[PDB]
Ligand binder design. Sequence first.
Ligand SMILES: [Ca+2]
Lengths: 236, 236
Amino acid sequence: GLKALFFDVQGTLVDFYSTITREGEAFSAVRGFQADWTTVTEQWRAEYRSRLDQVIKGERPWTTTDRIYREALDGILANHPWGASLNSADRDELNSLWSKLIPWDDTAPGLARLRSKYITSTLSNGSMASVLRISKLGALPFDAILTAELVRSSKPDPKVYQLALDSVGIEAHQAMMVACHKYDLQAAKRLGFKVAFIARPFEFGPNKKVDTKPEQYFDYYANSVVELAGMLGALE
Amino acid sequence: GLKALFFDVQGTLVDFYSTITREGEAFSAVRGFQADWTTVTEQWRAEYRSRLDQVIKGERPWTTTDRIYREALDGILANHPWGASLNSADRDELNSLWSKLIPWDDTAPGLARLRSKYITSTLSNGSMASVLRISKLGALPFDAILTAELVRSSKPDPKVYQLALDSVGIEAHQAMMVACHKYDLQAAKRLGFKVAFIARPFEFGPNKKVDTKPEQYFDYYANSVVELAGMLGALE
Ligand SMILES: [Ca+2]
């Protein structure tokens, strides 16, 4: 009997691409600048992923994801003419967008229906501070906020998923992992979780290949959190 | 400026005395025993607190709060003549009441007013699973659910208060600890937190004397979460 649902956040529930682009161009429209924010996002994510690789590879000490995004921003703005005009405080403002990630239109209605039938919680690699603020700013209801920062690691570390089971007080087969990333669902299913895949074809913006094809080990396959709620029988 | 409020749960927000005594009485009606549940309650908590102190002093391995309550229950049932007539399943049902504690009348309206103005989170010694279920069952809104289980300790360990600051991403002077127990606010105020004391004159039942006098280090003294919300300017 399913009892709790754990949701990945970035990409699965929120649209970080549209957030960085539209809030960046407004950030540059206030000071007077001109930059391709689509290429800014890829570089920021690349530096963010170039540096978190080092953390678990041992080439960088552990630090919250907000700090990694802030430091990655310093590395990418060195390759931009307007980057020097942004002081230490201007770059903190830019970095705070990761705590303001805009939700997909189906996220709030689907989460509310699921919470009325199950225990719901986050389980993502982001910082607790950012995920907390993303859910509060977006009025996304959860019964708890859990990130891998609570065990100083990141998915697919088995102890991140054990954190979910220990915190909610249930066994693996009573829990479901919801995500748009297949490495997440593979690791959770290995540990006995149920897994629900949410196809997010626009996660990385236009002209990007996204693997959304169904897999046999998926317990559920949906194109929205609202659709997943209907499959689980979580009505209005 | 205040940014986040952290709440103790047991006693501060929920009435465990009334939950145990009444639900224990209802539990006993269909099983054929009558007991004085005001003494069973304080025997349970005394047994729990003694086994908990063994975990703290290193004389017993760490387990969740629910497991200590469950073993304390086995302890007190051995001292009552009707204890043997309760099998393991009956005792798990009795022990589950620690996850169903009813809130005080003021808790739900006060938390919602405070959440519309601040980030709010729990920060108690209970288990994550029980505090999570207490808020879900009682419709107590929090932006986050934190307990000392997340650092495998107990207040007033400074690690528990640092967990609150790390998870929400603020500094001590921007956080307030809200509790009905003075030991909690003493440690938090020592660590830079603001502190709000909520007087719960009936935390331990009708005729047990309770320390509710004001203290000079309190930033706020209230008799309800509703009153604290008014003192902080958080109107409906
Ligand atoms: Ca919440």
